[PDB]
């Protein structure tokens, strides 16, 4: 399986590990030199919360597995039962997760009140609709 290329993480059962077996719907041979730093997997994006940087519903998001991210970076973050993709603004014991769409509102997370962890760092996008 290690030589099948990047796993494609499709739909994601609430509270479940991102790379759980039952989530990997595909695999694509993608050059490792393509993304910096290296992609470890591809995450299908949902919704249009990031359309303004061109990360559209349906796009495959190259994600580098790490918990080491900075403010200003597009993170993949787990909040209680959910996983989202946003620009990170950390601020004391309050973490903001910023959309790239004016129709969307920043998610504001209280670290005392909710489990918040970083799943990885978005390093690239692959779009492969049948119609562009």
């Amino acid at each position, epitope marked *: 399986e290690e030589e099948e290329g990047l*796993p494609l993480v499709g739909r994601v059962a609430a509270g479940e*590990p991102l790379l759980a077996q039952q989530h990997i719907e595909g695999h694509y041979q993608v050059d490792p030199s393509l993304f910096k730093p290296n992609a470890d997997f591809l995450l299908r994006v949902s919704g249009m919360s990031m359309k303004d940087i061109g990360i559209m519903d349906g796009d495959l998001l190259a994600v580098h597995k790490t918990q080491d991210v900075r403010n200003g970076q597009v993170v993949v973050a*787990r909040i209680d039962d959910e996983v989202t993709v946003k620009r990170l603004k950390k601020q004391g014991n309050k973490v903001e997760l910023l959309p790239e769409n004016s129709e969307f509102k920043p998610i504001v997370v209280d*670290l005392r009140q909710q489990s*918040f962890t970083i799943e990885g760092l978005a390093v690239g996008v692959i779009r492969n609709g049948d119609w562009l």
Partner: nanobody
Amino acid sequence: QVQLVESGGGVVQAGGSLRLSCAASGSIFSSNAMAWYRQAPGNVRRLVAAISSRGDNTNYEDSVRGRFTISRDNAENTVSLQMNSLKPEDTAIYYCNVGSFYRGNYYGGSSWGQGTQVTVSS
């Protein structure tokens, strides 16, 4: 309906030792990677250590590597954090997590215990 319970926390002097334990109840334990996270005051919760389902592989946060070891006991449904050379940096709520390993890396899910407080002082 997985239920996790951390224990073993307390107050410890710098350079000392301490052992955390987690009891997992509503799961098929042999089938899951287990991990320890920690959350220090006003900071993002980070993974400290993880172990694959049968313990073949582990992960460690760089700053606890060589100081902390994780292990699990499949007969007893527990996972444990042996903490040596405690620094003040180590002060946090420690949480037990259920997750899964893929290509040598722990990916976690959203089940947590209530947490156990570790405080390092002099």
